[PDB]
Design a protein around this ligand. Structure first.
Ligand SMILES: CN[C@H](C(=O)NC/C=C/Cn1cnc2cc(Cl)c(Cl)cc2c1=O)[C@@H](C)O
Ligand SMILES: CN[C@H](C(=O)NC/C=C/Cn1cnc2cc(Cl)c(Cl)cc2c1=O)[C@@H](C)O
Ligand SMILES: [Zn+2]
Ligand SMILES: [Zn+2]
Lengths: 400, 401
């Protein structure tokens, strides 16, 4: 029993309905998980030196036909109109990122320019194939685009690779399969361009001792790509990560920069996503942990509870201390038995349950108990807050 | 200058294009401002006990036709189709909030249920009427909908009112004009219901000692409302806040709860937004401050800089300390004169320029220069960091002395 649909209903994370096929209603607790995942990605964006931008939801069809994706993907577009002009709701964030790149004069000094976005994308997929958070219409891509020179591709692909494995290992995903898609029959650019582009991805992987299988037929018309597939605890494959070279879209959208020789060069563009889809990754995480989210991701991290009315003031004071320390905490002061209380929050998958009786109030302590059923006993209040802070801020998979 | 369109280009906050009319492209520095504003609103949502949800971008026309807004507002709807079904791109967040409310059986004990959202709304407005961040098509509403009983209305409107003045006072807006819109000709509900609903709004304003005025017959068909018009430093009026009672939508979308008497009851809905639009409000703030955003909102809060090559490592350490202290900081180690460095970052509206000369490195201090051109002297590094943190924590309008 690890269905994300089931756990999503039980823990009141999200729901879906027929009026909005493949588009998620995020409830309070599920939206908390979403935002903590977002905060985690932002810390990595800062570490790996990315800008974070936000592009518009719609854009003119005139611009979308200039991208070169229209013929292959017009059936997957959501279109709307206003004042005799047809606009596409964006399925990808790349054209919008080029529009920001084109504002102001760029030079080689500004490259590599790394532009990230939590980009809300909509794709008009057949409704019959939709299921849960795994196959959806509306989703949020942990997207970024790297504008760089031909000489900087090698280093930026290395950095993307490091960022992929770093982020996957945070959630305990160590079994990764890597696939390098080579030149297709369609394709733009010369054979010498594809020789170099394919070598840049291959050597970057080889130098990091990462084994990979070639995918000969597959690969986009605008460049080769690396795709990363993680494996969950049921040994199910999930293609999440991508690193995709592009020698087309920047030229077609009039992107350029002044080089060191004062000539106009078209920048090389690297598409990349790691989690793939925020909704989809949450689904995978919900199943991986079976509702037992690590404390940093958990909607409710601690519940503090009393035995009788005698300890209510102490529990309220302890609740405020935990809230002051940046912990998501609730107080359970109901007139129920301690076994009833602990069970409700053990079923809700609350990492820690802080019991406070007369023993604990007089001592300045708290009786800590995990959702796994491990009784840690009466511990000092300041010691508990300190260890919870470390677990949350280090983003540890394991409890005490 | 106080033109947000000019300043937006100068500080590289955002831009707009004819390919996406009335829809903002947020650059790094503008999106940084957006996200801190979002964090600020979030802390108020936590304080005033709101849930935060996220609804889908589109929903079937069939559901939108049931809301009772369709015939009045179908011209303003963006529409898209898929598999013989028509979907509206959401212009408002209320129906989606009702869909979330309708999941699970609700009790009187769950009320008042306060459900907030940073709701990305799209209104198909005329392109000739568009103008920068203020008049837009795509925007993010600091929205919330309170589901409550009839008896709970006064206390919830009272809370909303407090939240409005609280949030406006953070940005330096004390002069608020308040307008209570009364019953229109075409309306639902009995006159007895409208007497209580209008009285609930008036009593809540009286309870907060707020003088207001009527706007006669300007209320919506589904209930009366309060609107809050703030005044900037140029004495220009901006209608941002709204608190709108609703006796229609919950019933139209099958919203109910189990009462204390065990009867099925329909909840009353209070629509409310304080800032009104995140894009619009940032635009107003840009002109209010003239680009001199308070330190907590500033894209780059501190720039640490060296006079000569001698202090480059001291700058690196100091920049790392400010990095570890959660301050948005950059190091200016370019081979340029100290005045050149100060003039550029004064023009970019960086609150503080932490200057490092030989005398500062030797004493373990830093020379603090504000964007207003003032000299705060050479202070201890750990003192300055604690003071900057306190200025950011409290979201202070004023810089250090
Ligand atoms: C092309 N952008 C990248 C991306 O999304 N890569 C994953 C796979 C993309 C394939 N893909 C899938 N569906 C699409 C649907 C539409 Cl309507 C369009 Cl116009 C493009 C695509 C499209 O390109 C990100 C990583 O920047
Ligand atoms: C709709 N409720 C509130 C709100 O947005 N009020 C501000 C103004 C509302 C007036 N308004 C303006 N434009 C609209 C456009 C459309 Cl396509 C629809 Cl369906 C409704 C409205 C509509 O009601 C929020 C705060 O919950
Ligand atoms: Zn892309
Ligand atoms: Zn509303």
């Amino acid at each position: 029993g690890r269905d994300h649909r089931k756990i999503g209903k039980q823990l009141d994370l999200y729901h879906m309905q027929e009026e909005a096929p493949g588009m998620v209603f995020w409830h309070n607790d599920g939206w908390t998980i979403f935002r903590e995942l977002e905060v985690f990605v932002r810390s990595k964006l800062k570490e790996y030196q990315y800008q974070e931008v936000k592009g518009p939801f719609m854009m003119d069809r005139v611009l979308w036909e200039k991208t070169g994706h229209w013929d292959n993907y017009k059936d997957a577009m959501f279109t709307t109109s206003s004042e005799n002009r047809e606009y596409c709701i964006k399925p990808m964030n790349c054209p919008g990122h080029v529009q920001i790149f084109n504002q102001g004069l760029k030079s080689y000094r500004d490259l590599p320019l790394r532009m990230a976005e939590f980009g809300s994308c909509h794709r008009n997929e057949p409704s019959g194939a939709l299921h849960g958070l795994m196959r959806v219409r509306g989703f949020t891509q942990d997207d970024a685009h790297i504008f760089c020179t031909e000489e900087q591709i090698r280093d930026e692909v290395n950095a993307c690779i490091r960022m992929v494995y770093d982020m996957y290992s945070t959630f305990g995903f160590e079994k990764i399969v890597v696939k390098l898609s080579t030149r297709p029959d369609k394709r733009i650019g010369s054979d010498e361009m594809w020789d170099r582009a394919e070598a840049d991805l291959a050597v970057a992987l080889e130098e990091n001792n990462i084994p990979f299988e070639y995918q000969l037929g597959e690969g986009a018309f605008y460049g080769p790509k690396i795709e990363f597939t993680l494996y969950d605890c049921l040994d199910r494959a999930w293609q999440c990560g991508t690193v995709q070279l592009d020698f087309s879209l920047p030229s077609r959208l009039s992107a350029s920069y002044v080089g060191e020789d004062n000539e106009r060069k078209v920048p090389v563009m690297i598409h990349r996503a790691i989690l793939g889809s925020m909704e989809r990754f949450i689904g995978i995480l919900t199943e991986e942990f079976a509702g037992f989210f690590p404390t940093w991701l958990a909607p409710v991290q601690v519940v503090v509870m009393n035995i009788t009315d005698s300890q209510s003031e102490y529990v309220n004071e302890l609740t405020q201390k935990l809230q002051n320390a940046g912990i998501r905490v609730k107080a359970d002061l109901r007139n129920e038995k301690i076994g009833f209380k602990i069970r409700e929050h053990t079923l809700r998958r609350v990492p820690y349950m802080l019991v406070c009786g007369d023993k604990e109030v007089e001592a300045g302590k708290v009786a800590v108990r995990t959702r796994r059923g491990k009784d840690l006993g009466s511990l000092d209040v300041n010691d508990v807050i300190e260890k919870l802070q470390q677990e949350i801020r280090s983003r540890s998979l394991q409890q005490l």
